[PDB]
Write a protein that binds this ligand. Sequence first.
Ligand SMILES: COC1=C(OC)C(=O)C(C/C=C(\C)CC/C=C(/C)CC/C=C(\C)CC/C=C(\C)CC/C=C(\C)CC/C=C(\C)CCC=C(C)C)=C(C)C1=O
Ligand code: HEM
Ligand code: HEM
Ligand SMILES: COC1=C(OC)C(=O)C(C/C=C(\C)CC/C=C(/C)CC/C=C(\C)CC/C=C(\C)CCC=C(C)C)=C(C)C1=O
Ligand SMILES: [Zn+2]
Lengths: 28, 487, 34, 450, 100, 387, 116
Amino acid sequence: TIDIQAAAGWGIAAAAGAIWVVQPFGWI
Amino acid sequence: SPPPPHLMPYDHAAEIIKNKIKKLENPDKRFLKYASPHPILASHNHILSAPETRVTTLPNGLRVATESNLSAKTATVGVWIDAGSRFESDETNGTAHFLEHMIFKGTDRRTVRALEEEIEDIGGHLNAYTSREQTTYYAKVLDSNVNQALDVLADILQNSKFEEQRINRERDVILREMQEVEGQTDEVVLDHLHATAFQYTPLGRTILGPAQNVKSITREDLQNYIKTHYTASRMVIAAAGAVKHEEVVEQVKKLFTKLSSDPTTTSQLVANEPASFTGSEVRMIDDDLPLAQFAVAFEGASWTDPDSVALMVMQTMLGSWNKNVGGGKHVGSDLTQRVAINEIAESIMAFNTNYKDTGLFGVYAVAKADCLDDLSYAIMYEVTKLAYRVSDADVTRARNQLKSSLLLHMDGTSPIAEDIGRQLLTYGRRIPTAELFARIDAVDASTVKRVANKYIYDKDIAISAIGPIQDLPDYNKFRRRTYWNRY
Amino acid sequence: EVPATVEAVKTPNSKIVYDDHNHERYPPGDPSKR
Amino acid sequence: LTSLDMPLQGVSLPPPLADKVEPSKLQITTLPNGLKIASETTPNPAASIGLYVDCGSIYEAPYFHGATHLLERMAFKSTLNRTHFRLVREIEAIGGNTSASASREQMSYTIDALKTYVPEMVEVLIDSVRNPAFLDWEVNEELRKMKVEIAELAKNPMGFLLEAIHSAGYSGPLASPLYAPESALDRLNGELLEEFMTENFTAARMVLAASGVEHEELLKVAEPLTSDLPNVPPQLAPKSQYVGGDFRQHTGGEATHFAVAFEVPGWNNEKEAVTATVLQMLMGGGGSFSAGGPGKGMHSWLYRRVLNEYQEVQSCTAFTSIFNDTGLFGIYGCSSPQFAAKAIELAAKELKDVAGGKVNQAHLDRAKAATKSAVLMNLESRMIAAEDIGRQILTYGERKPVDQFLKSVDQLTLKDIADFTSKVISKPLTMGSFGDVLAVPSYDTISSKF
Amino acid sequence: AELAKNPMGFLLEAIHSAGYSGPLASPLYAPESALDRLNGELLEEFMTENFTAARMVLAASGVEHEELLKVAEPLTSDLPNVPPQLAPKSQYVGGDFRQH
Amino acid sequence: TIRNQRFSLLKQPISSTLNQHLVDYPTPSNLSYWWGFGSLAGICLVIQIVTGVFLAMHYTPHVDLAFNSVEHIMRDVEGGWLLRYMHANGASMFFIVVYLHIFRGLYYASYSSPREFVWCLGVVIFLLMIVTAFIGYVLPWGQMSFWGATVITSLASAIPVVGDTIVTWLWGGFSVDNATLNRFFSLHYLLPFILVGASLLHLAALHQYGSNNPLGVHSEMDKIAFYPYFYVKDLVGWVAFAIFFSIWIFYAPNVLGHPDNYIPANPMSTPPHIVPEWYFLPIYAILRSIPDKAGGVAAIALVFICLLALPFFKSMYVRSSSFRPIYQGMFWLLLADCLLLGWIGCQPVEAPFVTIGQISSLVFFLFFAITPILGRVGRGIPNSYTD
Amino acid sequence: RLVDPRKNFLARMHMKSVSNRLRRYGLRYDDLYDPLYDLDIKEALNRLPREIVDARNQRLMRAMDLSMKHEYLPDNLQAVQTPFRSYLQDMLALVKRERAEREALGALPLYQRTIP
Ligand SMILES: COC1=C(OC)C(=O)C(C/C=C(\C)CC/C=C(/C)CC/C=C(\C)CC/C=C(\C)CC/C=C(\C)CC/C=C(\C)CCC=C(C)C)=C(C)C1=O
Ligand code: HEM
Ligand code: HEM
Ligand SMILES: COC1=C(OC)C(=O)C(C/C=C(\C)CC/C=C(/C)CC/C=C(\C)CC/C=C(\C)CCC=C(C)C)=C(C)C1=O
Ligand SMILES: [Zn+2]
């Protein structure tokens, strides 16, 4: 039951990286 | 017309192999009724019955522990002492091993020949073994000679002469032993592992000691050692086999009268000179040796730490194997499977060493030079996997194997007496089998993951290697392979 | 005489001294700096 | 949890065993096909179950050279009912350990586990010996690991010499090697193993000895799996003749070795077996390569003479290999490549010295006590108990009590030791040397010493 | 290594050591253990004490004696005159070889 | 052997890798002329690179000069008409030789294990070839160049959120203009070198296992050296390709293209027949058939997804169409369907061609839908067809 | 099943066409199974007796020689060919069964394919 937690962690990482490259604060 | 399917030699061989395979296709169910390849945790506290282990404390703190089997024709009686190289000093280091050599060298009543003639006249055996934290002297004798063996042990412990010529002869025996530290490379590798891992602590010293210390050894040194360490509260007299508790207690009360009674106590000694782990390595490069031997270790657990049981289960999970084992490719241990399937070692062995305040948990391997890189990768992978992925089947199988080995190795008077003495020194009690089994079955997959994350994950390691080890990975690569960056 | 490597292999040393020109070690038994 | 110095709370402690437990009695059940099942109940929670077969290298002649040791390596592999992988997994599920041993006149298959797993142990053991699949890839793998097991043989001078003088001491079946040459292995295969095993593994030649199980359960599990076996009438083991002989492999270099052996009675003849064992204890000795632990034989004639009167000796002791109708008593030795002649002189002189009567009663009582304590102590082990039951029921069918052996040991006088050693060395000797044999004397010169 | 392939010569060598005792039982073909110790100095010691003039014969078929002496004398006359040593004595004793 | 002395110079470290990868590399002895199209593809790539480098010395990437610089090459550069026709028809030649290569791979099941990575690299190479040739066709800046650029750069508008942003980023503005042409020219110089690298990786991946053969069997027992046997075999194909290419260059230089690209680009008017090069016609037909903009882009991407997923489908163990009659028929149907799709792409969007294109795209996708089930069913052939 | 020649005549035509195509080259259907396609085939081939594998390899060499020469077998040789006489399928199925048993009990694979 650790692969699901790894997937969630890496999904959070991917989201953080997305908001960081494109920085869509003027669109949200 | 084509040939019939037995004319050509290759067609005939194909038919034969096909017939054998069809024979294997249909199993017989009378032989498939009981055994299962799936491990099940079983509770069998009925067969776990054992004779009572009686423990009596004398007024001076001496403990007498007996396990009676009056159907036996033999017995093992001995003394287990909370003493060893760890409790010496830097300048006294090696004295315990010298005493082990000197203890059967004669007393006021008995000369060397008298002592050997008395023993081997009854067909007995006398054994002396000293380690870092434990020392034991014991006799294997017939049931009749229990009192005689106890008298022999009490005499050698209390009334040894230590003649100067005997001391000088043993001095050269031990000096040659130090000059001949070869041929037992496992022991050498573990000594160097202890020396680097427990650097600047009493636990890092060898049992043998330095050559200057043995050269400097005199009578008063040995007498002072016995006075300082062989005290009533640090000694356990253990007997197993055809022995009655009451007779042994009376004999011990009669014979063990002139002990030391020094106030020095082992807990304080460990407290003021504690043992700590230092991540480090020693590489003894010798390209003329045909095989490489190395050990990788983490800091382990002490005897009384609850995690020690889980570390025993984990050691069983890693397992041990050599090239003469028939079924290494099929065992439950993934590390053994990798090693046996790819032929990447001569031998592999996981160890779990416990001490009073620390321990060592690691793997010892023997392999050829060109296998070292893959072997190191496999060892680190399977050790680090314990922190991430543990199947219920693997931990169940390891629990079953550990319980079986603990009960099966306990055969004979000598192993039972050793178990009694060791447990009384390390735990203060002989842990009954039912309690030990209950502690073992409390180790589930989540427990193994927790313990591995405490002891193995992102942790410093100690390495000791000797031989053609130029292709053994360096300290940084072993240290990196303690965590997985995909999690 | 015995060469130094043979003596080192035959006599484990728990009082190891590391080279200190570039780095000074923390006291032995110190917690890791990871 | 709690520290191991504090008892765990809430544990169900089984009641303790009595300090005096009445020993159980061997029950021997014979099946109509001739298979004998024996067991003894034991108080400890471990069961040892074995199958013992009166097959060995003395049946390989002439067309099965190497079959016995290959069968030893092929033990507990794939059956017709289970794959090797499944069988290893079933053994490990219950924390069991397997073992197989091959000798000139006996083979054994044993499994050890807690006594609650007896049905699984019995089932796995019989499937293994009755239904070998003998798959070609498994046989080929065990044959590659047979080449290593035979090449590393030169690394054990005692074992190498022991086999070599077995070869050089007999002529018939007993002379067939227990470690076949490499040429003799390029012929062995699964079909050969099947043909050999089917011929020799019969019910009337096999014993199921189980130490630590109730006979009812063992019968309930084992009867339905062995009765099918047909009745095969009891043949006779072949005869071997002891002769003289010399074994010599001049390899050169250093660290010579030798073994001078003579013929002694077999396991049949139950007063002289003992005379051989007590003789072996009397000469005694030690490996001279390691020390530690008084009472292991440091004050026997061999030790006290050689290792305490002549230095530069690397090994010196005595050995024994008794078969059903014959045996080999001998003395080992290492010495130095040019000291070899003196070493053989010393050994021969020691044999002659005990032959004449130069041994006093103190040494006789010492060796007698050593014999009795060695036999009584070796029965501490459950494994040895089970193996002894199996071997004795194979050989005698009775399991004679140890007390009879103890009286024979304590009925030995000096006149017996003297006449037996005189008889033993009045017959042809078997000489074997290994290493640098150039300085080692001839067979005739050594034979003339006795 | 390529000697067991010829049983004739292998047996002829083996029965020399199996039948004689002493120097004549010394193998002409040494085992592959005395070879790891053979070196140029061990061969130079062996040759200096054995290759002496009194144990040497220079024989020629197809040559005149005069100029043969003319060439040979300056290259051999300076060899030291060493006493003749007695031949090492061997003893036939009989014996048995065997190898399976 | 102890290499104390120098033997043959080809085995020296200066040329050992070229000797082992190009001269002595073992090759199945039964390879047909169908196996000579990879080298033809490589020679086409080299021809394109050399001719383009020498054409770029005279071309101006500006909207006021691009068309006129292309006409200045045709008219004023000594040898210029031959540089242009070789490059323009070379592009068509590359696509012909690469299509035959791909269909050779599909008939022998060359994509199957162990050569899946070879096929995936090939698909990436095909994508690179399409992008390179498209942006190259925009450089002349004729009518077809401008309107073809206007559509493919609008394909990003199928994305709901950022689609218009992506369209205006690729354009460099609010319309196809000088910025688009300049960035296309830069991309069009760079992409062929990435194609060279991808081809090198393709060949290395193939040489990990060696080439498949027309029997589809293991071939270790009958392999021969590439030089000189397959060298001369490939040389025959090279000379024949030269004859074919020369016919196109010297006698039919403009029949492979459209006359509309000879009109300077007009953003006001629009040609009534806006087509791509013939080698993009099947893709463009599959795009026009779906009646939803997004569904069309999805279908185009699904084409390449299907190509990439082909090697990994669980299949039967037989490779060659030589021993798979049903798969062989599926092949001859797929080839007819692709030629139908290409023809339909040139047809205007009007009945009956709309329905024909829809059915043809459906059949194209059915090939990939049906191949795995055939593999699963045919895994049981050896049990069923016994002796 | 529809792939049964005795029950379905389409399968009969399919089997006849495959047999005729195999017989032209002297190939068995099991000869089309390549060790490089899967590690299970490689293992099954390694478990077969040597003479069978040598016969397979000889047939493969003969077929490659015929294909390179644009030739078929002579009709006299074609008459004695046994295109559907099996030597591999049973061993392949046994290897698959052992593989599945290993997977079910949580053991590591005995062999794995290299990542290209
Ligand atoms: C009627 O209508 C139609 C036509 O008209 C006549 C046609 O002609 C066609 C045929 C055309 C095709 C089949 C081509 C279709 C497919 C594609 C993908 C074309 C190719 C598309 C492109 C132009 C893509 C070009 C690529 C880029 C702009 C890449 C941009 C970015 C770059 C260079 C780098 C990115 C930057 C970074 C990652 C930052 C860091 C960079 C570093 C290198 C460090 C069709 C279908 C059609 O319906
Ligand atoms: C720039 C374009 C390409 C070049 C230069 C090229 C080159 C080559 C070469 C030289 C070979 C080896 C010889 C041969 O069989 O032809 C080869 C093999 C192969 N190529 Fe390509 N290729 C290209 C594009 C593609 C594409 C687009 C695909 C498929 C999507 C592909 C798939 C393959 C396959 C499967 C093989 C193995 C063929 C076999 O062994 O039968 N290639 N390629
Ligand atoms: C680095 C290599 C290349 C360079 C420098 C280059 C350069 C050029 C230039 C300057 C033009 C404009 C002049 C003209 O149209 O004739 C052009 C056109 C073109 N190029 Fe390339 N090119 C290269 C490679 C390629 C490749 C590999 C392809 C094929 C995929 C290709 C396909 C085209 C096409 C289709 C045209 C339009 C031709 C026309 O109709 O006029 N080019 N190229
Ligand atoms: C046995 O296997 C082999 C094949 O398969 C059966 C082949 O088909 C071929 C023939 C085909 C080849 C080599 C294809 C060409 C190679 C590639 C990677 C495709 C495209 C190559 C280009 C564009 C070359 C550009 C690279 C350059 C110029 C590099 C710089 C080097 C120099 C200037 C010397 C060969 C030699 C081969 O052995
Ligand atoms: Zn010691």
